[model samples]
Target: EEDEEEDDEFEEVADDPIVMVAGRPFSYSEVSQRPELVAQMTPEEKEAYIAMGQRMFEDLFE
Candidate 1:
């Protein structure tokens, strides 16, 4: 019973991939096509973008 619950939890969380850059969400292939573009982002910019995602998620969930 616990294992089934854990599996459902994992599936829910696994639906979204970790964001590595700003702008719209991109698939692995799209990201791979523009390595230089993704690499140009600064650490702070990356974190701020992710923080925005988290805030959006929380607001939607609540």
Candidate 2:
């Protein structure tokens, strides 16, 4: 069906994870799609996927 075919074009990355930019709220999808919040680190480096967002967007959520 078209529904199944269309599903392949996108994926739901998270459950409404939101980030605020310049006093506005955006979903993880938006921020990442802006390509502003992309990062990579290991738990071996004192990180989680969540912390990647913090450090990149807000200086470790500071």
Candidate 3:
């Protein structure tokens, strides 16, 4: 007999009203409203996400 049950995870947007951003969880309301999104991040995580954006643009400019 073969047991076949599978589940998968995604790095991007998640199901329902919650989503994943920079490996963090945020609600639809929070992400659409940027200020609300930042509410869930600690100062450290905030800086890290910001740094990622900076590096992305840095590469784009190059």
Candidate 4:
């Protein structure tokens, strides 16, 4: 009975998904489309986006 309860709890936690971005949830299909937008970005713009991602991760974990 205890083992079954533990398994249920594990399944519940595993089923919950983490949202990575506000308007942009991470997905393989969307990522595949990134090069189109990314290709148009300047180096500085790309750096800013990368920093934005870092800040989001930092805030989420903190």
TM for every model, in the order presented, reads 0.33, 0.33, 0.40, 0.37
* Model 3 per-residue lDDT tens digits across residues 22-51: 567766445546865665666765675566
- For all candidates in order, the CA lDDT equals 0.52, 0.49, 0.56, 0.46
Who is ahead in lDDT, 2 or 4? 2
For residues 1-62, what per-residue lDDT tens digits would candidate 1 score against the true structure? 33664444333433345445555555433444666645754576456554655666685533
Candidate 2: give the clashing pairs: none
Candidate 3 TM-score to native: 0.40
Give the candidate number with the greatest lDDT.
Answer: 3
**Worst 10-residue lDDT window, candidate 2:** 38-47
Whichever of 2 and 3 has more TM-score, that candidate is 3
User: What digit string (tens of lDDT, one per residue) describes model 4 on residues 19-55?
Assistant: 2333344542343357654454456544555565566
lDDT of 1 at 20: 53
Ranking by TM-score: 3, 4, 2, 1
lDDT of 3 at 27: 61
lDDT for 34 (candidate 3): 88
- Candidate with more favorable, higher TM-score: 1 or 2: 2
Candidate 1: how many backbone clashes? 0
